[PDB]
């Protein structure tokens, strides 16, 4: 036998497991910590860096970098550290035995593929490798072959329409509004209620607020008036030290920035109007089958109400006769991984892999030509 490895280099969470599994065997944040403070106790064990879940525990004493920003890998040594931790510590597998499948956003700089491949063959000596678009995997994950895939992570949002397995590249739209730049806005709006969050390890505390408390307003202005009218929306949270904090109409105001990028100060339209303006680029024949098969993917899609706000507000754009349908399975955060576990297990896929000999012959230019 052999089993492929499946790895997804999200901006925020690494997800990894063996192909053919239905759930990732490791998840940990793609976070690298270095000691912040002068080390006093001689005889303490001083690890030069902490990676992943370790850095969660010790965050109070660390500066936490993320090596991925807006789906560009920004400094490659720490990325290598993350993959080293992943294969040796999380999966406990030698990559030299096991082929590996990797995942990327659709438009990100072309150099990124060359370098990511080079590291796999030169550093880890993987038997074979591949790179897949997230929006492609989400269709395998949702069990359908015609889709417009709306996928939003920590670092990137992107739309890709697929019809009968033909991707449609001109159709494709990308925004840099994502979980991270929700979090940063959440700091600035929490400051309105007189709470201050200045530091990276503390930013994670903000992120945990955003994950627990936030939700999407089904009418933004009507609930804003309702929250001005009454306490009833306002709700209570705990810091790590046990200070309780209470959070009002503002907790929806971050998910609202998805639908109004003007708040953060983006140029663009929000996710629904770019989804529509993507479909409008498509050939009129297909559009009826895109409007049914909306698939939402990636963890930023997880807020309650975002399905119903998406369906309502896109219905305002689309002509009345075509029924809009939106499909938001409760596990979609994984779904890019689940669909990569599906893809890496196909017998037809086995011919696709970029192999060691063929890479040595070509050099990393091959990753553009063969892989897509």
């Amino acid at each position: 036998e052999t089993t492929a490895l499946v790895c997804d280099n999200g901006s925020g969470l690494v997800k990894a497991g063996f192909a053919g599994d239905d759930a990732p065997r490791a998840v940990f944040p793609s976070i690298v910590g270095r000691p912040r403070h002068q080390g006093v106790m001689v005889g303490m064990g001083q690890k030069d860096s902490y990676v992943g879940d370790e850095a969660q525990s010790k965050r109070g004493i660390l500066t936490l970098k993320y090596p991925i920003e807006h789906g560009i890998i920004t400094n490659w040594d720490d990325m290598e550290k993350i993959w080293h931790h992943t294969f040796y510590n999380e999966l406990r597998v030698a990559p030299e035995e096991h082929p590996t499948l990797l995942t990327e956003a659709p438009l990100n700089p072309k150099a990124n593929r060359e370098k990511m491949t080079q590291i796999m063959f030169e550093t880890f000596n993987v038997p074979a490798m591949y790179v897949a678009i997230q929006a492609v995997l989400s269709l395998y994950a949702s069990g359908r072959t015609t889709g417009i895939v709306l996928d939003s992570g920590d670092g990137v949002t992107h739309n890709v329409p697929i019809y009968e397995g033909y991707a449609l590249p001109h159709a494709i739209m990308r925004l840099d509004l994502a979980g991270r730049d929700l979090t940063d806005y959440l700091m600035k709006i929490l400051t309105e209620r007189g709470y201050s969050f200045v530091t990276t390890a503390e930013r994670e505390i903000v992120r945990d607020i955003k994950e627990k408390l936030c939700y999407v307003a089904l009418d933004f202005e009507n609930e804003m008036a309702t929250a001005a009218s009454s306490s009833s929306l306002e709700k209570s949270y705990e810091l790590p030290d046990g200070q309780v904090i209470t959070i009002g109409n503002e907790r929806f105001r971050c998910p609202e920035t998805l639908f109004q990028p003007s708040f953060i100060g983006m140029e663009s339209a929000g996710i629904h109007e770019t989804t529509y303006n993507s479909i409008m680029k498509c050939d009129i024949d297909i559009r009826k089958d895109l409007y049914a098969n909306n698939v939402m993917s990636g963890g930023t899609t997880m807020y309650p109400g975002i399905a119903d706000r998406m369906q309502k507000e896109i219905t305002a754009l689309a002509p009345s006769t075509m029924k809009i349908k939106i499909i938001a399975p409760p596990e979609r955060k994984y779904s890019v991984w689940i669909g990569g576990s599906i893809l890496a297990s196909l017998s037809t896929f086995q011919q696709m892999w970029i192999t060691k000999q063929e890479y040595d012959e070509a050099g990393p230019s091959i990753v553009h030509r063969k892989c897509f």
Binding site: E69, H70, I72, T74, P109, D176
Partner: peptide, 7 residues
């Protein structure tokens, strides 16, 4: 990135 954005 290299231009229009910080990464």
């Amino acid at each position: 990135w290299x231009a229009x954005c910080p990464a």
